[PDB]
Amino acid sequence: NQRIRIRLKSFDHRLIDQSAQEIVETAKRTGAQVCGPIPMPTRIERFNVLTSPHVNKDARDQYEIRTYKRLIDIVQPTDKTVDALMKLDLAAGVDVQIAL
C-alpha cells in the first residue's frame, strides 16, 4: 500500500500545467496508474501603491500576484517509477514536493 503524492506550486499556470503534464506522461510511460492532476484553489494577493512621490492619494497602481497549486497521485508504483521521478528535471519557477 504505497502511494506517491506530488504537490506543485507556481506563479505561472502555463508552466505548472506543462510540468504536471510532463510528470504524468513520464509516469504513464513507466507503467503506473496515476490520478490527476487536480487543480487546487488559487491564492491571490493584491497591493495598492501610490504613484506620485509626494501627494496624490487617488493616484495608485493596483498590483496582484497569484499562487497556483496542483496535486498528483501515483498508485501502484513500479520500481522504475521512483528513480524516474528523481531523474526528472526541475524547471525554474515551479516547486515540487514529493511524499511517500
Binding site: 505561472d12 497591493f47 501603491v49 501610490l50 504613484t51 512621490p53 498590483y63 496582484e64 519557477g93
Partner: protein, 100 residues
C-alpha cells in the same frame, strides 16, 4: 534616509540579535508556574535591567534600498517608490497589473 539613521537601525538589529537568547530565557522563567515567586521576581528585575535596545519593539522597518520609514510592504522588503519602479521594470517574479 540619512546614513546616521541607517547605522542606528543596524546597531539596534545587532543588539537585539545579541540579546535574543537571555530575554527568552528570562521570559520563560517568569512564566514558569513551578518556579518560586522570588525566582520570578528577580527574573523580572533582570529583564527590566536589560539594555533598552535589546527590545524588539524599538525596531522600525525600512526600505532595503533607500531606508524610507513609510510604506514598507513586508512581503517585498521595499518601500512604495522602489517597488513601483522595479515592478514596472519587470524584476519581481509574478507581479502584474491587477484588474477584475
Amino acid at each position: 534616509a540619512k546614513k546616521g539613521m541607517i547605522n542606528r537601525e543596524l546597531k539596534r538589529e545587532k543588539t537585539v540579535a545579541k540579546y535574543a537568547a537571555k530575554r527568552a530565557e528570562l521570559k520563560a522563567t517568569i512564566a514558569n508556574v513551578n518556579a518560586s515567586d522570588e525566582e520570578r521576581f528577580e527574573a523580572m528585575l533582570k529583564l527590566q535591567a536589560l539594555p533598552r535596545n535589546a527590545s524588539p519593539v524599538r525596531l522600525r522597518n525600512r526600505c532595503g534600498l533607500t531606508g524610507r520609514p513609510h510604506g514598507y510592504f513586508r512581503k517585498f522588503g521595499l518601500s512604495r517608490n522602489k517597488l513601483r519602479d522595479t515592478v514596472m521594470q519587470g524584476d519581481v517574479p509574478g507581479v502584474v497589473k491587477a484588474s477584475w
